[PDB]
Ligand binder design. Structure first.
Ligand SMILES: CCCCCCCCCCCCCCCCCC(=O)OC[C@H](COP(=O)([O-])OCC(O)COP(=O)([O-])OC[C@@H](COC(=O)CCCCCCCCCCCCCCCCC)OC(=O)CCCCCCCCCCCCCCCCC)OC(=O)CCCCCCCCCCCCCCCCC
Ligand SMILES: CCCCCCCCCCCCCCCC(=O)OC[C@H]1O[C@H](O[C@@H]2[C@H](O)[C@@H](O)[C@H](O)[C@@H](O[C@H]3O[C@H](CO)[C@@H](O)[C@H](O)[C@@H]3O)[C@@H]2OP(=O)(O)OC[C@@H](COC(=O)CCCCCCCC[C@H](C)CCCCCCCC)OC(=O)CCCCCCCCCCCCCCC)[C@@H](O)[C@@H](O)[C@@H]1O
Ligand SMILES: CCCCCCCCCCCCCCCC(=O)OC[C@H]1O[C@H](O[C@@H]2[C@H](O)[C@@H](O)[C@H](O)[C@@H](O[C@H]3O[C@H](CO)[C@@H](O)[C@H](O)[C@@H]3O)[C@@H]2OP(=O)(O)OC[C@@H](COC(=O)CCCCCCCC[C@H](C)CCCCCCCC)OC(=O)CCCCCCCCCCCCCCC)[C@@H](O)[C@@H](O)[C@@H]1O
Ligand SMILES: CC(C)=CCC/C(C)=C/CC/C(C)=C/CC/C(C)=C/CC/C(C)=C\CC/C(C)=C/CC/C(C)=C/CC/C(C)=C/CC/C(C)=C/CC1=C(C)C(=O)c2ccccc2C1=O
Ligand SMILES: CC(C)=CCC/C(C)=C/CC/C(C)=C\CC/C(C)=C/CC/C(C)=C/CC/C(C)=C/CC/C(C)=C/CC/C(C)=C/CC/C(C)=C/CC1=C(C)C(=O)c2ccccc2C1=O
Ligand SMILES: CCCCCCCCCCCCCCCCCC(=O)OC[C@H](COP(=O)(O)OCCN)OC(=O)CCCCCCCCCCCCCCCCC
Ligand code: HEC
Ligand code: HEM
Ligand code: HEM
Ligand SMILES: CCCCCCCCCCCCCC(=O)O[C@H](COC(=O)CCCCCCCCCCC)COP(=O)(O)O
Ligand code: FES
Lengths: 58, 42, 73, 223, 184, 101, 139, 51, 533
């Protein structure tokens, strides 16, 4: 491929981003619970306060 | 399909002549190339 | 160990006997099972202890069986 | 005021009934009775945004408020009319008291805070973990009235401190200590969060030791 | 006789990074359509006595960057270093001028929590400023690499693609400056 | 409303004055003030090594390194209505030692 | 590489037409007028394909036919060095761990963790960018 | 004390002590490292252990 | 003048003490220049800074447990009852100009001392530097680490604030009294009675400023003398043998480097002392047994012990009317850990059977079992250390506190096993990566298409080649192998000048030619020495 190290970086970014989003399940409240589409204002800090939603976003 | 299973580190110890979108087929069945050009259109 | 398995086998300590690791796995599993004895009232952690112990016993048993049958050395 | 009472009921009906009931009696396994919790409980729970709650878990978090000051007064008046209870301290103009709640004896406040509060909130109100998913939060954002009503009403798992257990002057000393330990700068450099040994040991390893090893690598050779 | 691979990759990525700013422009225009006649609303008083000189400095940094590119294509590592140091200083000046504008806007009551206008203004201009900071980091890293080995064509290609990024940042700023300070 | 859930310890059935209970604030594990009192769970949490004691079941440990319950103080009131102790602890207070029980 | 430019120019034609049509059709007989989010997105999608297509079209008219652009090129036309392709590196996983540190810091709003993650990112990206340019150690 | 006019300047006293002390001896150390690396002759010496 | 004075003083010294030969032997001593051989002197310099700042602190500190009423400037504690120790610790940080800075430099230096000892221990263990003839000096170092841990603990216990007093009540008082048969007697010998008493802080002060630091100083002297007269180990490399030392002489290069490193370590610790708050005891209050705060961590070098207390289950025994409480396990555990650390060289020579003299180090990849064991030990240490901070982690990172306890409990068994397996395979994998370069040369990253369409990567051989052109396979020699062509000089040099302006071309040419000639001469010198021996 044109950029072998960028290719490796893309894979590792996939893996660690997916692990960050799934780690919501190890919090007490749990993971994101506002759907994969994440409609507003259900996703705002007033209506989804947990850390699961923020971990999902990042 | 014109290289080994698995491919080497840099994928190719040689390349065939590329004249269509079926280069491995033409590599493995040269006798068919003429037919492939003749029969291509209904 | 042979140098085909550990290339620097003559430069350092390269072999740990398999019995040490098999017995250590079994004892670690047994230790996970003995922490079910405690003051805790929930059982979520009991299931986690049982699962980790089961995985350890399965890995030890697979390794032991495959060495006995000659599939790994 | 009848207008304030009907506005509070009107706000309550499309925000709080699903969990607390139409008559403020509670909905079982969903939310408790509000009878006798008082205006002070409403003020604390709604002005810090904890109410309305969004789900059941270990602990309901604070979040941006869903109502403004007059709506909070209306809701508190409506709840007060059903059972009474404690009220939020006011000033001369009838506003929620903030500055007059700062007591004059911060040394007594610190001694009282360390006896009654630091077990759950830490030496300087930085927060601390509780049993299973719960936690006493960082105290650095609460205004004086929020601190006062938090002591007065005993939220979630926080003990309730009555005006007989901690008199109003003791509470004002405590709020003075809480506010001043939040606004005082660090004296010896960057405060590192105020938790002590754990962030200090993190700073040694990631700053001091990394610097020392990098300098050693620069001075020394490889291979 | 063949495309510069690093160049094409950089151009392709920059075109993608245009869509990121598309999202922020959409946020800005949605908030502006809901303004109700007051845009910017009180108390926000934008001042062009400071935005304009900062904009002009950022534009002139593009000419200095292009001069560095000409030196690099010429094989002159020292001319490249001089022009890229000048460009770095000018972009740093842009960042500081933006920060000073931010500070004066915050004191008069235009903040992210304060109003919808503050939210869009600060996300748009602040993400652009973050892109500028990333470009300054890129200048620093490129200039350090020219001291590491001899000046090869690959090193000159690296300079060229860093300049592609800098021109993208400048043009995005021109678009943001036109829509915020004149199409109010 | 929670008084029906209280389980008494043998020898300590009358140590409470109605709905007032008194336990030692000294943790039985290693002596820290075990004073993180959760009113809804009725859980006493020790900040030092995370022992948890069930206030409704005579401060019996339910989590952590503590194996022993917190000692209960018997309490009552006097003629003026002030809370007073109704005797001593019936067991030694604080961390254990070789000589104990 | 004229086909490469043509692909993006064709996409550009469609995207520009769609953007203009959508803006005009929502300005007229659509509630609220111009739908700004979708119009902006379509205009800048057009811009994306325009940037890439213009770059390819400028590149194509410079260089004459490559062996991959030539209908009856021989395999031996492509003999010689291709370029540099990194043989190995552990810097990509360090960059992703650093960026994930900063992301966890932003998710939980821990400013010190965000600072540490940004510092890690800068160090890891320097490690990647310098990997094939550090000279020998000097003594 | 808290909320006084002098509290901010007081809060920088110890930081300034550490910045001026730490920088000073830090800079002398750097300068001496550079002098060794750039001016003192490069050397390779071999000693017999006799151990 | 300045030269005649030096000759006159030199002759006066030599006529009176005749030290010329011994001094010259010290000037000609050769030290290897490896970056990791500088790890021990970070610990030495931290100890020196600790001595200087500690002497400064003893001029102001009153370690009395006598209770007084605070009369100082710190308004949030006015009128509060406290010990004289807490009183004078506050007086240092508020009433003595520079006292807070000195105190913070002392505490940061203590943290750097412990961390340096840990990292230096890791080098010693993973490179095999403990092997004979150097077993005793590993033992001396092990004792130094234990003494440093307890010295730092006693030191931060001295101010008698709430946090450190909570640490004293649980660890020093609770665990001690829990000890079977002799527990309570040890407690009453140490405290003079029950906790807290009136003698504890003065006694700890005496232990902390004189007795323990004197033992540490004696042990450090023995340690450095053993290193000096046993002649430091080295890594395998060109010209390096079991019987020589390759490096630089003391005079002047090693002396200059050591002095400059000392100055830079001092600078870092001084920047930390006046840029980062450590232990702001006025925020904590004086110690009272009725009070406590969330987050009762010790300094990091003690955390693992505290972590062990947090993780071990509530297992107790009650034989014949007696009590063996939970803390006894921790005590035993600590002893076991220390006994395993001191005894490791003899354990490994018993297991491996290797009892040979060793002056050449092992690369950690080449001893895969010991590397796996040390990685396993570091994994356990980190798990216990983070278990100690489990409450802080629960608050900041949104994990149930109960869950953190169980993660630590299960991970205490599982994480070291996983780490052992991974580290073992990783070490052998690095061995294979070295072998690859030995048979094929350095992958340059340049791909080439042959006329028939093959893709080949260009390799740079590290030795002689064939008539076909492939390299002759080289033998591994225990030394690192280059893997980047730029590290072999392929990148060249930019071009002489300032950063912005070039020098005259003739200067650049002369400088580059001289540099290449010098590098070639150095390589040739090492090569011919190697060929001769
Ligand atoms: C809050 C979290 C973080 C806090 C951190 C705070 C602490 C700071 C630590 C400071 C490190 C001390 C180093 C001092 C040396 C200064 C003298 C100098 O010019 O050295 C040149 C020196 C080359 O001399 P050499 O010893 O002959 O090198 C051998 C080979 O040439 C090289 O052969 P090689 O290819 O094997 O080695 C190349 C290696 C270069 O890196 C290193 O070898 C040094 C890395 C140190 C890591 C420490 C160990 C921890 C690991 C666990 O590649 C990299 O890994 C590049 C890393 C990116 C550069 C650093 C950028 C950081 C910016 C932060 C924003 O290279 C460097 O060390 C450059 C990196 C440092 C840049 C200067 C930054 C100074 C200011 C720091 C704070 C601001
Ligand atoms: C995935 C791989 C495996 C196969 C595929 C999938 C397997 C998983 C399936 C598990 C299904 C679980 C149920 C899901 C729903 C759920 O969410 O839960 C329900 C409820 O539960 C609790 O209520 C209990 C009751 O329902 C209430 O009626 C009651 O009142 C309450 O009473 C408590 O509380 C009271 C005060 O309130 C006290 O009065 C009272 O005394 C008590 O304490 C109860 O609670 P309690 O018993 O604590 O917990 C128990 C809960 C809690 O959930 C759980 O399953 C716990 C989670 C278990 C996690 C399993 C870990 C697996 C190990 C790892 C894989 C190891 C590593 C390997 C990795 C890779 C390996 C490769 C190298 O049920 C269970 O365990 C179910 C039993 C079976 C679990 C499965 C075990 C399988 C492993 C064994 C074999 C080994 C593997 C083979 C290897 C070769 C409360 O929480 C409630 O809120 C909650 O609502
Ligand atoms: C060899 C060199 C050695 C020397 C190194 C020196 C470096 C340190 C700096 C030097 C010190 C300056 C001189 C004098 C001190 C000073 O003048 O100081 C002012 C005040 O400052 C803090 O006040 C914050 C606000 O100003 C107050 O308004 C607010 O009240 C206060 O709030 C606290 O108190 C409240 C009670 O009221 C609570 O409510 C509340 O919650 C909280 O506790 C605040 O504090 P806080 O949030 O702590 O810090 C936040 C910091 C931000 O973080 C920091 O920079 C800390 C950095 C050091 C920490 C290092 C941690 C390392 C982690 C590990 C690596 C982990 C990862 C490893 C695992 C990975 C896993 C993968 C496998 O602010 C910011 O700048 C944010 C914006 C950007 C930050 C950048 C600044 C510098 C670094 C930037 C790095 C590059 C890019 C930019 C980053 C964004 C408090 O201290 C106050 O006492 C203090 O008064
Ligand atoms: C025994 C025990 C305690 C067990 C619990 C362990 C545990 C589960 C910890 C993880 C907690 C997290 C990170 C929670 C969210 C879930 C999550 C994202 C998990 C990881 C998912 C995953 C593996 C995939 C993504 C890739 C990846 C590896 C992610 C990076 C994870 C990172 C970098 C997180 C940090 C981990 C961690 C526990 C660090 C501790 C840091 C410490 C001890 C710092 C102390 C400290 C604190 C706490 C301050 O408050 C402070 C304030 C001001 C200045 C400084 C500091 C400071 O340094
Ligand atoms: C109060 C307050 C503000 C601070 C508290 C005081 C405090 C904590 C410390 C100050 C004292 C201190 C640690 C001073 C450091 C002084 C140093 C290390 C200066 C060195 C400067 C320097 C490198 C000059 C040139 C001389 C050279 C090249 C080196 C000579 C040299 C030196 C200087 C050594 O230290 C040394 C140590 C061990 C073996 C050999 C040597 C050696 O040969
Ligand atoms: C990244 C971190 C961004 C920090 C944002 C922040 O804290 O700014 C908010 C603050 C407004 O706070 P406010 O309640 O209005 O009171 C201010 C009184 N001086 O002050 C502001 O309004 C800050 C303005 C924004 C600064 C630029 C941030 C860039 C956005 C990228 C995300
Ligand atoms: C543990 C049992 C606690 C003790 C003792 C005290 N507090 Fe607390 N507090 C605790 C919790 C679990 C919570 C959160 C409850 C919620 O309903 O979400 C609180 C909350 C507060 C607050 C509100 C903070 C805010 O988010 O800004 C304040 C101001 C507060 N607590 C103060 C406080 C004081 C002064 C205490 C001593 C009397 C005190 N708390 C005791 C847990 C515990
Ligand atoms: C106060 C703590 C310690 C100090 C100040 C200290 C200091 C030093 C120094 C300066 C050296 C020589 C330079 C070097 O290799 O780094 C050294 C060598 C040595 N140290 Fe330490 N040390 C300490 C603790 C330890 C520990 C914990 C161990 C291991 C358990 C240890 C074992 C050794 C050994 C074996 C050597 C000689 C190694 C060799 O020749 O290569 N020391 N020490
Ligand atoms: C191995 C060496 C040492 C270590 C690890 C060490 C560690 C510590 C630590 C962590 C503290 C607490 C600091 C604080 O206030 O925040 C302390 C306090 C103290 N130490 Fe040391 N120390 C060492 C050597 C010495 C020596 C040799 C002296 C005496 C000359 C000394 C004198 C003091 C004094 C007087 C205090 C109390 C005053 C105070 O806390 O501020 N120390 N020590
Ligand atoms: C340490 C205090 C004094 C330091 C001065 C001593 C070192 C210089 C004297 C000798 C060098 C110059 C030539 C010379 O005078 O030759 C001679 C002096 O040196 C000697 O013969 C003995 C010197 C041994 C003492 C050194 C011990 C420690 C010194 C190390 C300090 C870094 C005199 O020359 P001459 O007699 O005229 O041929
Ligand atoms: S002292 Fe209470 S759990 Fe250890």
């Amino acid at each position: 491929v044109a950029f072998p190290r960028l290719n490796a970086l893309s894979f590792w970014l996939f893996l660690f981003g997916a692990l960050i989003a799934i780690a919501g399940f190890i919090t007490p409240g749990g993971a994101a619970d506002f759907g994969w589409t994440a409609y507003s204002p259900l996703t705002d800090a007033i209506h989804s306060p947990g850390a699961g939603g923020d971990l999902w976003i990042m | 399909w014109a290289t080994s299973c698995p491919p080497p580190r840099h994928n190719f110890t040689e390349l065939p002549r590329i004249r269509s979108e079926r280069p491995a087929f033409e590599l493995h069945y040269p006798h068919m190339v003429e037919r492939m050009r003749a029969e291509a259109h209904v | 160990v042979d140098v085909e398995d550990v290339p620097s086998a003559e430069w350092g300590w390269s072999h740990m006997p398999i019995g040490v690791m098999h017995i250590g796995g079994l004892l670690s599993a047994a230790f996970l099972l003995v922490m079910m004895r405690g003051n805790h009232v929930g059982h979520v952690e009991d299931w986690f202890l049982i699962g980790f112990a089961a995985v350890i016993v399965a890995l030890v048993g697979r390794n032991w069986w495959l060495r006995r049958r000659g599939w790994i050395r | 005021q009848s207008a304030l009472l009907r506005t509070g009921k009107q706000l309550f009906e499309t925000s709080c009934v699903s969990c607390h009931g139409a008559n403020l009696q509670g909905v079982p396994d969903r939310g408790p009775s509000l009878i006798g919790t008082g205006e002070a409980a409403v003020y604390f729970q709604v002005s810090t945004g904890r109410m309305p709650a969004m789900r059941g878990e270990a602990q309901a978090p604070s979040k941006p408020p869903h109502f403004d000051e007059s709506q909070i007064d209306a809701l508190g008046a409506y709840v007060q009319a059903n059972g009474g209870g404690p009220t939020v301290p006011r000033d001369d103009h009838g506003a929620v008291a903030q500055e007059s709640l700062i007591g004059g004896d911060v040394a007594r406040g610190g001694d009282l805070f360390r006896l009654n509060c630091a077990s759950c909130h830490n030496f300087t109100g930085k927060g601390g973990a509780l049993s299973s998913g719960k936690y006493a939060p960082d105290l650095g954002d609460a205004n004086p009235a929020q601190i006062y009503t938090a002591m007065l009403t005993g939220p979630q798992n926080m003990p309730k401190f009555s005006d007989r257990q901690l008199t109003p002057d003791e509470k004002r000393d405590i709020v003075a200590y809480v506010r001043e330990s939040a606004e005082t700068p660090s004296y010896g450099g960057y405060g590192l969060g105020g938790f002590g040994p754990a962030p200090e040991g993190m700073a040694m390893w990631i700053i001091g030791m990394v610097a020392a090893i990098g300098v050693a690598m620069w001075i020394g050779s490889r291979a | 006789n063949r495309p510069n691979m690093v160049s094409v990759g950089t151009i392709v990525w920059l075109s993608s990074e245009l869509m990121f700013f598309a999202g922020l422009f959409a946020m800005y225009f949605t908030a502006r359509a809901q303004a109700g006649g007051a845009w910017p609303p009180e108390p926000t008083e934008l001042n062009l006595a400071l935005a304009v000189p900062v904009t002009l400095v950022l534009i002139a940094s593009s000419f200095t960057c292009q001069m560095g590119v000409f030196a690099a294509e010429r094989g002159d590592v020292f001319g490249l270093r001089r022009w890229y140091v000048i460009t770095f200083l000018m972009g740093l000046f842009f960042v500081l001028g933006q920060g000073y504008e931010y500070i004066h806007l915050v004191e008069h009551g235009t903040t992210i929590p304060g109003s919808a206008y503050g939210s869009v203004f600060y996300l748009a201009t602040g993400f652009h400023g973050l892109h500028v900071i990333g470009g300054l980091v890129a200048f620093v890293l490129l200039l350090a690499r020219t001291k590491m080995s001899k000046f090869t064509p690959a090193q000159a290609t690296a300079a060229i693609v860093v300049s592609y990024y800098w021109h993208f940042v400048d043009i995005v700023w021109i678009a943001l400056f036109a829509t915020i300070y004149f199409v109010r | 409303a929670d008084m029906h859930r209280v389980i008494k310890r043998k020898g300590q059935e009358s140590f409470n004055f109605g709905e007032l209970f008194a336990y030692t604030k000294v943790c039985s594990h290693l002596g820290c003030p075990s004073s993180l009192y959760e009113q809804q769970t009725y859980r006493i949490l020790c900040p030092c090594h995370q022992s948890q004691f069930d206030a409704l079941e005579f401060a019996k440990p339910i989590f952590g390194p503590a194996a022993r319950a917190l000692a209960q103080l018997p309490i009552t009131i006097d003629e003026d209505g002030y809370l007073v102790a109704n005797g001593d602890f019936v067991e030694p207070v604080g961390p254990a030692f070789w000589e104990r029980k | 590489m004229h086909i490469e430019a043509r692909l993006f120019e064709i996409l550009t034609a469609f995207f520009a037409l769609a953007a203009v049509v959508y803006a005009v059709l929502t300005a007229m007989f659509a509630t609220g007028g111009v739908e700004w989010a979708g119009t902006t997105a379509l205009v800048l999608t057009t811009g994306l394909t325009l940037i890439t297509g213009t770059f390819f079209r400028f590149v194509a008219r410079r260089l004459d036919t490559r062996p991959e652009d030539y209908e009856d090129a021989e395999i031996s036309d492509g003999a010689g060095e291709l370029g540099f392709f990194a043989p190995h590196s552990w810097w990509p996983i360090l960059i992703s761990l650093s960026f994930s540190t900063a992301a966890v810091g932003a998710a939980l709003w821990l400013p010190w963790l965000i600072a540490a993650g940004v510092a890690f990112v800068i160090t890891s990206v320097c490690g990647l960018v310098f990997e094939y340019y550090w000279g020998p150690e000097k003594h | 004390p808290f909320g006084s006019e002098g509290e901010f300047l007081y809060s920088l006293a110890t930081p300034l002590y550490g910045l001026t002390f730490g920088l000073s001896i830090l800079s002398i150390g750097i300068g001496a490292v550079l002098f060794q690396k750039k001016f003192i002759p490069e050397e390779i010496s071999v000693q017999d252990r006799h151990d | 003048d300045f030269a005649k004075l030096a000759a006159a003083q030199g002759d006066a010294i030599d006529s009176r003490y005749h030290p010329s030969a011994a001094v010259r032997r010290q000037l000609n001593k050769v030290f290897p220049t490896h970056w990791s051989f500088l790890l021990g002197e970070i610990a030495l310099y931290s100890f020196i800074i600790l001595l200087l700042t500690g002497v400064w602190l003893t001029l102001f500190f009153d370690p009395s447990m006598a209770h007084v009423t605070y009369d100082g400037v710190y308004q949030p504690l006015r009128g509060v009852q406290m010990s004289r120790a807490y009183e004078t610790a506050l007086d240092i940080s508020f009433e003595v100009r520079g006292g807070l800075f000195v105190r913070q430099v002392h505490h940061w230096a203590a943290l750097m001392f412990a961390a340096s000892i840990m990292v230096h221990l890791a080098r010693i263990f993973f490179t095999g530097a403990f092997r004979r003839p150097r077993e005793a000096n590993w033992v001396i170092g092990s004792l130094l680490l234990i003494l440093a841990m307890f010295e730092g603990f006693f030191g931060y216990s001295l101010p008698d604030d709430l946090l450190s007093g909570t640490g004293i009540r649980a660890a020093l008082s609770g665990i001690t009294m829990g000890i079977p048969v002799i527990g309570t007697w040890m407690h009453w010998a140490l405290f003079g009675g029950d906790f807290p008493g009136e003698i504890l802080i003065p006694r700890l002060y005496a232990l902390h400023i004189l007795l323990i630091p004197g033992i540490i100083l004696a042990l450090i002297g023995a340690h450095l003398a053993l290193v000096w007269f046993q002649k430091h180990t080295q890594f395998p490399g060109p010209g390096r043998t079991e019987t020589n030392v390759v490096g630089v002489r003391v005079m002047p290069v090693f002396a200059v480097k050591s002095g400059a490193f000392f100055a830079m370590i001092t600078g870092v610790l001084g920047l930390m002392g006046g840029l980062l708050t450590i232990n702001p005891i006025w925020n904590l209050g004086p110690y009272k047994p009725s009070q406590v705060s969330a987050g009762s961590q010790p300094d990091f070098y003690m955390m693992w012990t505290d972590g062990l207390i947090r993780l071990w289950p509530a297992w107790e025994f009650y034989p014949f009317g007696h009590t063996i409480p939970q803390g006894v396990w921790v005590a035993v555990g600590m002893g076991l850990v220390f006994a395993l650390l001191i005894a490791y060289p003899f354990i490994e020579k018993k297991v491996t059977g290797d009892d040979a003299h060793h002056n050449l180090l092992q690369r950690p990849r080449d001893v895969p079992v010991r590397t796996a064991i040390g990685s396993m030990a570091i994994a356990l240490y980190l798990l216990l250390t983070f278990a100690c901070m489990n409450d802080i982690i629960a608050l900041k990172f949104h994990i149930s506190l109960n869950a953190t306890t169980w993660i630590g409990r299960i991970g205490m068994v599982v994480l070291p096993a996983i780490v052992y397996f991974v580290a073992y395979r990783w070490a052998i994998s690095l061995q294979r990566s070295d072998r690859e370069v030995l048979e094929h040369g350095v992958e340059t990253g340049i791909i080439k298409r042959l006329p028939h369409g093959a893709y080949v990567e260009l390799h740079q051989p590290l030795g002689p080649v064939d008539e076909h052109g492939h390299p002759i396979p080289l033998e591994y020699a225990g030394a690192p192998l280059p893997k980047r062509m730029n590290k072999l000089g392929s990148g060249g040099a930019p071009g002489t000048g300032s950063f912005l302006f070039p020098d005259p071309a003739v200067e650049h040419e002369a400088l580059t030619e001289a540099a290449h000639a010098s590098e070639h001469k150095s390589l040739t010198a090492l090569k011919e020495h190697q060929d001769r021996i």
